[PDB]
């Protein structure tokens, strides 16, 4: 069934689950594993990815959801940050920000501006730190960056801890309900 | 706009956000405020509702989501329980269960069986304890019990802490995308 998903299922998944790039301009992308981790201060921690980008680069939500946590005047650890809760257990986090433009409890639309990149906290310089998690579990963010309508299998290969078939069964019942209402 | 929502928005909201009764058979419904709270052991705690029902009554998910936490062999506090995370910050919890039939990380469909009612923990007898929350904040569960297609304003009157207009703007963009794909 993961090979024969319909377009309605694909479009719905890409509104609800993080996908694509959260920033339009960057000079480099590097895993956080390869620098001193913002909290643990050692290399080798599986912890998402950093977009090397100049101060004040706009940062955009990677899927619909709700803001559940922000830090707006912090210069320690992750620094200023936004965490977005998405459907079906996914979350995305955006850190080291210069400025935060959304409030906790605010509903979020995919592509909405949520802040401006900075160097706050233990950043190692001007960059956006980005993580995608599933019930708090760290995932390979690159698989979600590369996920789009023309590359739909990308995120589905993050399959060890996520039961994608069962998620798409749930989404099929949502798409069928709207076809019945058309 | 909350008066002129289309049917596609209404149907989508009722798949994603808790609504209706999580149990088919009960003798009484009473707020948990009116009994000794499972944890605090005093009256007057705003804490959801209890369905007075006999042991082994099946318990059903009130919306689509993901199981984020279970207790399966507990006889203290809330007892055996399932917590379901829904989209847009909502959660539902089902407690005092005799048996739990879902695992953490499992995707859930609205109406799916999730366990069997019991008297586990500080239950005060055979009952299902049920709570609906928004980013961890307790809500008036009766407003979600009474919410359905023919009574669509019911949950929308829980309006003090939830920006329903903004939520429905987000849902409108999902419904428009599927109309464009039809």
Numbering used by the authors:
A (entry chain A), B (entry chain A): 120 to 301
Quote the paper.
H. pylori Csd1 and Csd2 belong to the M23B metallopeptidase family and may act as the d,d-endopeptidase to cleave the 4→3 cross-links. The overall structures of Csd1125–312 and Csd2121–308 monomers are similar to each other, consisting of a helical domain and a LytM domain. The helical domains of both Csd1 and Csd2 play a key role in the formation of homodimers or heterodimers. The Csd1 LytM domain contains a catalytic site with a Zn2+ ion, which is coordinated by three conserved ligands and two water molecules, whereas Csd2 has a degenerate LytM domain with incomplete metal ligands and no metal ion is bound.
The model of Csd2121–308 monomer accounting for residues His120–Asp301 was refined at 1.80 Å to Rwork and Rfree values of 18.1% and 21.8%, respectively. The Csd2121–308 monomer can be divided into two structural domains: the helical domain (residues His120–Gly139 and Asp259–Asp301) and the LytM domain (residues Met140–Leu258). The LytM domain of Csd2121–308 adopts the canonical fold, in which a central seven-stranded anti-parallel β-sheet (β1↑-β2↓-β9↑-β6↓-β5↑-β4↓-β7↑) forms a two-layered sandwich with a smaller anti-parallel β-sheet (β3↓-β8↑-β6↓). Unexpectedly, the Csd2121–308 monomer (referred to as chain A) in the asymmetric unit of the crystal forms a tight symmetric side-by-side homodimer with a neighboring Csd2121–308 monomer (chain A’) from an adjacent asymmetric unit. In this homodimer of Csd2121–308, a surface area of 1,550 Å2 per monomer is buried at the interface, as analyzed by the PISA server. The pair of helices α1 and α3 from one helical domain of Csd2121–308 pack against another pair of helices (α1’ and α3’) from the helical domain of another Csd2121–308 in the adjacent asymmetric unit to form a four-helix bundle through hydrophobic and hydrogen-bond interactions around a crystallographic two-fold symmetry axis. Numerous hydrophobic side chains are present at the interface, which are distributed in both the helix pair and the LytM domain (β4, β5-β6 loop, β6-β7 loop, β7-β8 loop, and β9-β10 loop). Two characteristic motifs (HxxxD and HxH) of the LytM domain are conserved in Csd1 and Csd3, whereas the first histidines of these motifs in Csd2 are substituted with Glu165 and Lys246, respectively. Despite the absence of a metal ion in the active site, the Csd2 LytM domain possesses a substrate-binding groove formed by four loops (Loop 1; β1-β2, Loop 2; β4-β5, Loop 3; β8-β9, and Loop 4; β9-β10) on the central β-sheet.
